Design a protein around this ligand. Structure first.
Ligand code: HEM
Ligand code: HEM
Ligand SMILES: C[C@H](O)[C@H](O)[C@H]1CNc2nc(N)[nH]c(=O)c2N1
Ligand SMILES: C[C@H](O)[C@H](O)[C@H]1CNc2nc(N)[nH]c(=O)c2N1
Ligand SMILES: CN(CCC[C@H](N)C(=O)O)C(=N)NO
Ligand SMILES: CN(CCC[C@H](N)C(=O)O)C(=N)NO
Ligand SMILES: [Zn+2]
Lengths: 407, 411
């Protein structure tokens, strides 16, 4: 019931009690660990509501006060009457900050309490969604001095009037299969791009075409919009030592903004809740650039560095990887766009874990996602035992809308 | 039930049925994953089903399930258990058992090799000197002048828990660590406590940065005894770099034979508390962990100093740069001296092939992603992208408490 986690580099042992407040299921059993798997009515709603208001009122030191009991009554009244209920602005902000706080795959949670919440629950159309999103984009980007933000569209009702951003992130690049057989641009977005084209988008068929937004309001058929090019801050990639690096013609965008997740607060479901912070360097330079099913540039880069690519044991892939990652960090820092390196981010997360342990009784963390995709063991998180469990409010995966939508 | 795992790089999907045969616990529950936790005297009653399960597995593997030889062996084992409270494995079963413990070892990336294991039967051993002799022969055999061969040596099983055979060393070959009065450490900080025990037992310490530790060997529950492995049997590799000529002046070397000696081998309910085994190194074990962990030799600074990297900010990736150069050095050195070693690309790629074959032929391959993914360059290896299922099959290798914590000293 009381659980210990040990850091094997420092011997510091922490005690976790927060896991006893765990709501949802992990995917694991006593027989099988699924730690590495990517994706493992009125009566339902009141305990969920209660559980949430209880933690809310506890957080503002007013547990069992008049205002607390009155609110539970009011919400109780409203559920019984309307089958759903509405959050106060205060609850909405608390809920969103806590969904981030509870995100076990997020290394950047030291920042959790500095989140700008944009309430877009008064939104009714796709043009309105586009407006809200442009405003979020400009606010978060802040001319390169990035600020964390979330924009929250209206909650699910009967489930046939869902708000959804069909895009996986607000800003991503198009993917195109060619007669050649190869892939131009980002192979991860080939399918979404096809959906855009069949919906009407004139694709310029280039390597780094910022995708348009495909926005769905009120369960209606989704609609296309180009984000003002002037609002999409992009960074050309160069190297502080390699003159040739720029000739690869690589760029990335400054704003990482996940737009396909579902925010659950007090049982209510917010199916459109795009949020953004800022990049850790490895996300772009290791994953986006070097994954075999992504831009897959290691082969080209190693060539230009004239490494011996005959045998895997020369560590040529490893050498190029480091340089590509040096260039990403340098390019962002030179253009004054917020970015964090994996050493600094993981050092912060360890400090955050210690704060959460002493102030909250723990910190759900998924080691598989928290450890950076390069240089794992030279970052402190590699050596830190973590317990993974699901707390609410939460960000959840949800099915991609094209498989769900009834046109 | 059928469980699917996906590779997110290739979209190849595999189906696991093998997990249905898993008995032991993971530490995880429906409410908590303990997948990153390092560490999450049997009755007659508990012993017979364990023996039965094992013997059924053994007889199935040789295509003799339900045969007269199978049934006679169950009855013979049953009788032996009721009469003596334990039983003895036939040589054939011991070999099968030891190979399957390796096959089942979910944290081992080298399992493509599982069917090629030389098993040395040391169950006739009675004394610490006997153990020393067995271990010397294991080292010489496995080393093979640099052309490493996988091996395990199996000492007598647990009886009453008061007569255990144990190798107190965590690996047969390791370097001493010494805590200085000024709080710094000479040698390997991981081995300070064990080095202190050795000294107290009467080892005369040379007190340098790479002193091969003596063996501390416990036979039949007696107090352990010290022995020095003959130096001519300990193959070592001076570390140098293919392009950086100052690298040799760091004074680094490592030993060629990685030989885990502190684990417990479970076969058919029987417990083999001393079962040292060895394969060969994957380069990152030495170049990433042994050299660059902060709590190990911790050489990152000195290497980066010598490379003249910008060290004023982490975001130069200086640590990452030094790290790669050190790992190139380790692979180059071992290759140049004709000592078996495998790089993390080759080893992970082979593991994925192994894993896919096991799914097809066996119905699964339990694997601990946290341990399988190498400690540098994670996602440019195919294992990072492979979903895995972790579960516990027997025969198995298990952790056991350190013997200095449990031993009853006789004096
Ligand atoms: C402030 C800067 C932030 C940093 C440096 C950061 C860091 C990261 C990183 C590196 C990942 C892994 C991404 C991947 O591999 O695909 C991640 C995942 C995640 N983060 Fe953050 N984060 C930040 C802000 C935020 C914010 C503002 C939120 C929500 C308000 C958030 C919630 C999440 C969630 C839910 C995931 C998992 C997403 C998934 O499963 O795909 N993070 N974080
Ligand atoms: C043949 C070459 C082999 C290679 C390249 C290899 C590779 C590895 C590596 C890199 C690890 C992780 C080590 C660490 O981080 O401490 C490991 C773990 C392990 N391997 Fe192997 N292995 C090999 C042979 C063997 C053999 C012969 C056995 C036993 C018969 C074995 C059983 C295990 C076990 C039980 C672990 C887990 C150790 C622990 O939990 O501390 N392996 N393997
Ligand atoms: C199969 C495995 O779970 C998968 O590759 C994970 C591993 N760790 C990860 N870690 C992060 N941060 N992001 C990812 O997409 C992944 N992918
Ligand atoms: C806390 C964490 O489980 C621990 O540091 C693990 C991570 N993965 C590992 N993987 C291997 N191969 N060896 C290790 O010692 C570790 N250490
Ligand atoms: C969640 N993450 C954004 C994910 C972006 C993605 N990994 C990418 O590398 O493009 C993040 N840094 N939060 O803002
Ligand atoms: C288990 N592993 C050996 C472990 C050795 C350890 N990583 C070391 O570097 O000393 C191995 N390759 N087996 O042969
Ligand atoms: Zn688990």
């Amino acid at each position: 019931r009381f659980l210990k986690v040990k850091n094997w580099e420092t011997d510091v042992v922490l005690t976790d009690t927060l896991h006893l407040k765990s709501t949802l299921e992990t995917g694991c059993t006593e027989h099988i660990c699924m730690g590495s798997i990517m994706l493992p009515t009125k009566d339902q709603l009141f305990p969920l509501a209660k559980e949430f208001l209880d933690q809310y009122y506890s957080s503002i030191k007013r547990f069992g006060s008049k205002a607390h009991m009155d609110r539970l009554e009011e919400v109780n009244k409203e559920i019984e009457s309307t089958s759903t209920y509405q959050l106060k602005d205060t609850e909405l902000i608390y809920g969103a900050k806590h969904a981030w706080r509870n995100a076990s795959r997020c290394v950047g949670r030291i920042q959790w309490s500095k989140l700008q919440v944009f309430d877009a629950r008064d939104c009714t159309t796709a043009h309105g969604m586009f407006n809200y999103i442009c405003n979020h984009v400009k606010y978060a980007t802040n001319k390169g001095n990035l600020r964390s933000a979330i924009t929250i569209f209206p909650q699910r009702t009967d489930g046939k009037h869902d708000f959804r951003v069909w895009n996986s992130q607000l800003i991503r690049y198009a993917g195109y299969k060619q007669p050649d057989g190869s892939t131009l641009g980002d192979p991860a977005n080939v399918q979404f791009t096809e959906i855009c084209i069949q919906q009407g988008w004139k694709a310029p068929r280039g390597r780094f075409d910022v995708l348009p937004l495909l926005l769905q309001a009120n369960g209606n058929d989704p609609e296309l919009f180009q984000i003002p090019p002037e609002l999409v801050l992009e960074v050309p990639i160069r190297h502080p030592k390699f003159d040739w690096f720029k000739d690869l013609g690589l760029k990335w965008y400054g704003l990482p903004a996940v737009s396909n997740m579902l925010l659950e607060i007090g049982g209510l479901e917010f199916s459109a809740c795009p949020f953004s912070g800022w990049y850790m360097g490895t996300e772009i330079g290791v994953r986006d650039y070097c994954d075999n099913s992504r831009y897959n540039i290691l082969e080209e880069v190693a060539k230009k560095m004239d490494l011996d690519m005959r045998k895997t044991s020369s560590l040529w892939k490893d050498q190029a990887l480091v340089e590509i990652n040096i260039a990403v960090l340098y390019s962002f820092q030179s253009d004054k766009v917020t970015i964090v390196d994996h050493h600094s981010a993981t050092e912060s997360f360890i400090k955050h874990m210690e704060n959460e342990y002493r102030c909250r009784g723990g910190c759900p963390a998924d080691w598989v996602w928290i450890v950076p995709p390069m240089s794992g063991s030279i970052t402190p998180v590699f050596h830190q035992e973590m317990l993974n469990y699901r707390l609410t409010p939460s960000f959840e995966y949800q099915p991609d809308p094209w498989n769900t939508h009834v046109w």
